[PDB]
């Protein structure tokens, strides 16, 4: 008979300490939950004490036992005699925090054992499930426990320590120049100055109307990151096959007309440039492309983890685009699906400590305004994305709407939400002949 690891002594000590000391409840409150107790009477006692504490009522022996008696739940717990025994047995000079931590650890271990048993039972009786589904199920089961225990890292911090850390960070940024770049280099001077690079562990959202160069801009960023670093760069393309992406990349890097490449009308110099580009790419060998359709966040996260494990770090992750992703459990409501996607992306960004650039799209309502430049509210149906995003960039091109625009070949990257810097608009040159973005050499305002 397997014996699950349960510490009845720790739970009894916690209960006795709470009865004999009501000031420590908060310390217990941040270490254990009601479901963490093995026996049903202990869970019921904790729930009643939580209700009393939230109502302002004392949690002494008489009031707790009486409250259980009034609701008729005293008999299930064990009685006033049992409550008095629990109160009296526990010595006053006890550290409730240690016992609470032991109880907290035991619940995690019990959940792990339950998940292992579920996986084994599912394997023995597949009920038509595939091996891939079982592997995904096991990964999800383990990651659920990991996140269940990955919530203690968030809480209040000391004011003086925060101030000292902020001062140290300011000094360090002014100490190590890097010419204004602290994160992953974007390959553009003005964007680097306004962003200090692409900060690791931050979610980046790129949004625009159709035909604005969103995929083009993302690919230019990816190529710049690959050429200016050594860590691998991963691309998730749910909308294009990898061959078209590579053709676009060849047009951008070799500065050859995309139509010529697509139709094959290339001369000797174009072939030489393409050979040079291929040689550089094969010498570097740090770009990975995944053109699978109907991607799920689990597959994206698993592939990112595998790349980081294989190569010891990821320079940048790119997803195009998140409106094509699916969560099967929440297909009924799109807003819940989007929230789950955003949460999973943020968790992946935190876990791998990498910059993640996810592309998004805007509704037609933006085009109902006289000024079509995007704003934050144009992220309707994706509020969780706007909240969880650490950087938000919108792409705008005036020449798209106006033929006679004076800004032909000029694109605007608008920072609608920046976590660690200022917002503003950056103008760049758009060479659609080469399918590329470049630094703007004209006057800046």
């Amino acid at each position: 008979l397997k014996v699950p690891p349960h510490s009845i002594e720790a739970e009894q000590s916690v209960l006795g300490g709470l009865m004999l000391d009501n000031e420590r409840w908060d310390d217990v409150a941040e270490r254990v939950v009601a479901d963490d107790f093995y026996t049903r009477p202990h869970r019921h006692i904790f729930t009643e004490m939580a209700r009393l504490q939230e109502s302002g009522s004392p949690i002494d022996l008489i009031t707790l036992a009486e409250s259980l008696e009034r609701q008729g739940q005293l008999d299930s717990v064990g009685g006033f005699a049992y409550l008095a025994e629990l109160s009296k047995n526990t010595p006053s000079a006890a550290n409730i925090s240690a016992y609470a931590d032991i109880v907290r650890e035991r619940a995690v271990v019990r959940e792990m054992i339950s998940v292992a048993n579920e996986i084994a039972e599912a394997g023995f009786d597949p009920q038509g499930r595939t091996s891939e589904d079982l592997l995904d199920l096991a990964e999800s089961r383990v990651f659920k426990i990991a996140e269940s225990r990955a919530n203690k890292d968030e809480g209040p911090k000391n004011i003086a320590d925060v101030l000292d850390a902020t001062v140290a960070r300011i000094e360090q940024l002014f100490q190590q120049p890097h010419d204004g770049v602290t994160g992953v280099n974007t390959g553009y001077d003005d964007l680097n100055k306004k962003t200090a690079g692409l900060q690791p562990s931050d979610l980046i959202i790129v949004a625009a109307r159709p035909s604005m160069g969103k995929t083009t801009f993302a690919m230019n960023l990816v190529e710049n990151a690959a050429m200016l670093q050594d860590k691998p760069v991963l691309i998730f393309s749910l909308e294009m096959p990898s061959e078209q992406i590579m053709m676009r990349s060849l047009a951008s890097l070799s500065r050859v007309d995309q139509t010529k490449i697509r139709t094959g009308q290339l001369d000797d110099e174009d072939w030489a440039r393409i050979s040079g580009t291929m040689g550089i790419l094969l010498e570097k060998r740090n770009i990975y492309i995944d053109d699978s359709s109907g991607l799920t966040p689990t597959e994206v996260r698993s592939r990112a983890r595998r790349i980081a494990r294989e190569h010891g770090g990821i320079g940048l992750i790119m997803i195009d685009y998140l409106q094509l992703m699916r969560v099967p459990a929440l297909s009924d409501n799109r807003t819940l699906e989007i929230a789950e996607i955003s949460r999973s992306l943020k968790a992946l960004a935190k876990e791998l400590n990498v910059p993640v650039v996810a592309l998004s799209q805007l509704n037609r309502s933006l085009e109902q305004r006289a000024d079509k430049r995007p704003v934050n509210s144009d992220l309707r149906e994706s509020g969780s994305i706007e909240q969880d995003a650490d950087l938000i960039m919108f792409i705008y091109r005036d020449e798209v709407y106006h033929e006679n625009s004076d800004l032909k070949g000029i694109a605007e990257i608008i920072i609608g939400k920046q976590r660690n810097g200022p917002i503003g608009t950056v103008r760049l040159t758009f060479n659609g002949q080469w399918s590329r973005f470049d630094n703007y050499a004209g006057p800046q305002y």
């Binding site: 001369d267 000797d268 291929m278 040689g279 709407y401 106006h402 033929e403 006679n404 002949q433």
Partner: protein, 113 residues
């Protein structure tokens, strides 16, 4: 001389009908720079605002008045805006392209190609 409101509207409609084949607005056989600017501005305004015939005529009259005031005060109209050259000159045959592809395959040793 500058065309009147009716002639300007007729030219704008003709440009709207016949610009579906020209590579760009500057390639249109404009009589003068002022005609190009006025017709293009009216066309873009109509496209972005769905202006009716009367609204188009009013906008044409306003643009003509503004242009006349600008001319009376001087100023020199630059030659459109221009956008890139035409490039060209690709005398490449199939045999040379195939030889280059084979050379690329041999140099990079592509197993799948």
């Amino acid at each position: 001389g500058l065309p009147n409101v009716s002639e300007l509207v007729d030219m704008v409609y003709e440009y709207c009908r016949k610009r579906g084949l020209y590579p760009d607005a500057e390639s249109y056989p404009w009589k003068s720079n002022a005609h190009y600017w006025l017709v293009t501005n009216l066309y873009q305004n109509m496209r972005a605002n769905a202006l009716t015939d009367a609204e188009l005529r009013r906008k044409a009259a306003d643009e003509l008045v503004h242009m006349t005031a600008r001319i009376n005060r001087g100023e020199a109209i630059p030659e459109p805006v221009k956008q890139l050259p035409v490039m060209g000159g690709r005398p490449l045959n199939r045999a040379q392209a195939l030889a280059k592809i084979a050379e690329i395959k041999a140099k990079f040793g592509l197993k799948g190609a």
